Amino acid sequence: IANQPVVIDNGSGVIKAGFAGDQIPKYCFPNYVGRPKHVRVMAGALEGDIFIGPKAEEHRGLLSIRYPMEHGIVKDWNDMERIWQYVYSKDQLQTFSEEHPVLLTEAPLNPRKNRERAAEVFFETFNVPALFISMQAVLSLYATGRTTGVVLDSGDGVTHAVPIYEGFAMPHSIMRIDIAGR
Amino acid sequence: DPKYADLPGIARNEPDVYETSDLPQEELTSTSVEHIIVNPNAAYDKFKDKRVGTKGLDFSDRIGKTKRTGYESGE
Ligand SMILES: Nc1ncnc2c1ncn2[C@@H]1O[C@H](COP(=O)(O)OP(=O)(O)O)[C@@H](O)[C@H]1O
Incomplete structure (x- = not known):
């Protein structure tokens, strides 16, 4: 068996990530969540509105942003899942849930129910073998x-x-x- | 002699045509606006298979929801 885990540093706004034993978190960006502030009709655009990544900086003056991790605590569960799914993109990850473990960060003095729901996500929707979260x-x-x-x-x-x-x-x-x- | 001696009052020797004699932008210096060399097939391949879907294609000045943006379904 050989499954290198992924060190994923969350945070108030920013999230960092990279596999185990690395030296630089391969991918880093914040909790910016955007969707078009305007209305398009003519063909040429993209469709889906959940356009978060380098495209957001590329399309700043077009979308509406939000940060559901209020004080490090998730509110829009669905949106956080989508964020993590964006993390699961190929050029973003190329790996699967079951394929590798993950390490994560615990901001203390928060309701553990957040962790409950999230654990259910990563071990039911996603099926990561093991995920540990801990004190920064x-x-x-x-x-x-x-x-x-x-x-x-x-x-x-x-x-x-x-x-x-x-x-x-x-x-x-x-x-x-x-x-x-x- | 169609009518010479017959009728002496009909025109002839008339040159009624009235002759003459045979005596016969791209200020691109500016830097104002571009153009594109037309190639309808190139742009046709550009907008080749955009499967745009019109779910609830509504753009009225109706006030009952958040916002309205049709032509949104893709592949
Ligand atoms: N150049 C900077 N100047 C001032 N503040 C910064 C700068 N870069 C980052 N920060 C702040 O420091 C924080 C980094 O601490 P960290 O715990 O990693 O953040 P996060 O909790 O958002 O991951 C960022 O959230 C940001 O608000």
Whole structure:
């Protein structure tokens, strides 16, 4: 058996992704969700309206945008699924769900029901063999190599400070304020 | 002699035709607007098989939904 997983870094607005053991997240872009702000009749355009990717930057002044991952919490489940399906595109992935595992990020202090519904998606609709989601501070630990310390991370709308010594938690010690750049 | 001595009042020697003598843009300097060399078959192959579908092709000034954009179904 050989199934290289995919390190997928979510976030407040931005999402990053690349296979295991890489050095640069192969694909990175935010939660921008768009669909044409105007009406087309004449042939020459594209059809579907869920046009998200480089085309969005290519067609900024044409579509309406939205960000359903409010404070890192999914609202438009369907749209997030579509986002992930866009991730599943060939030039975007070329792999299947069952073909590889995936690693993901956990923004703490959120309702786990979000994770419930999402887990059902990736293990029922998609059928990924295994998917683990975890604290973003641990990621910073591996990047630094150190195991002791606090890490305050900030995306576009959430800030959380994690004090953990030697990779050993102190849940009460952890603090946060969820508001940033947005 | 059709009518010479008969009728002396009918025209002849008349040159009633009134003669004469034989005596006989692309300011592309500007940079205003382009044109395209027509090739109907090239553009025909351009718009070759666009399976445009007209589901609910409605463009009235009706006010009952969000927006209306027909000619939307594809392959
Ligand atoms: N050049 C920049 N200047 C200021 N802020 C930035 C810049 N680049 C990114 N940011 C902000 O920092 C955040 C990156 O933190 P991260 O947790 O990776 O974001 P996200 O949570 O959206 O993935 C982005 O969400 C963005 O709001």
